[PDB]
Write a protein that binds this ligand. Sequence first.
Ligand SMILES: CC(C)[C@H](NC(=O)[C@H](Cc1ccccc1)C[C@H](O)[C@H](Cc1ccccc1)NC(=O)OC(C)(C)C)c1ncc[nH]1
Lengths: 99, 99
Amino acid sequence: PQITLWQRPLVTIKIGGQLKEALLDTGADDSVVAGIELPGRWKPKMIGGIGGFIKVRQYDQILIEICGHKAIGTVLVGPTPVNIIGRNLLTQIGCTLNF
Amino acid sequence: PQITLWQRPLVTIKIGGQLKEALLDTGADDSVVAGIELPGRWKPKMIGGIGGFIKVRQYDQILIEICGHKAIGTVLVGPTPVNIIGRNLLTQIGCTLNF
Ligand SMILES: CC(C)[C@H](NC(=O)[C@H](Cc1ccccc1)C[C@H](O)[C@H](Cc1ccccc1)NC(=O)OC(C)(C)C)c1ncc[nH]1
């Protein structure tokens, strides 16, 4: 759908059987979700934002349903304030920026 | 323009005479630019992403030109890693998220 940006572009995601709300974030290369039990292995990764870096866990091949659209990609789990759906998932659901 | 998100959505800005590139960011409420000299007065405000809060200087009524589209809003000047054009400016240039 066409999302206007007057309010925060929050969407509902279904990941690992858990229902959560997440931000459609064009300034995020990677998607980082906090507080979800995700099974399997992980590699260390450190991602940077404004104010610095945080250490998260890189989980691969995780299925995500972002507003009823299916995608499989990389999900970082760790200390974020808000759940971020970054470009690595936004491309799969065919999300574009228009103006 | 229609921007696909396979590459970072970097766009040209003309702010207070200085030319710079800035990332169109749906996940940013505010706009923050690094390195520019800006006219006038400012209040303190601290803003925070993942990682932490940082101290920025907020100047209101700044004329910024985002890819030939002119807009006036609050620009925060502080040590950011990349320049961010947040939703407060994205709404004025008519930016919408589509899928
Ligand atoms: C992995 C994501 C988290 C990260 N992106 C961000 O942090 C981007 C900007 C950025 C890109 C590249 C380098 C530095 C900063 C900012 C995010 O959109 C964050 C998401 C967020 C919102 C609210 C609370 C906490 C986090 N927004 C944000 O920082 O907004 C403000 C208004 C504070 C500038 C990123 N993109 C590329 C590399 N790292």
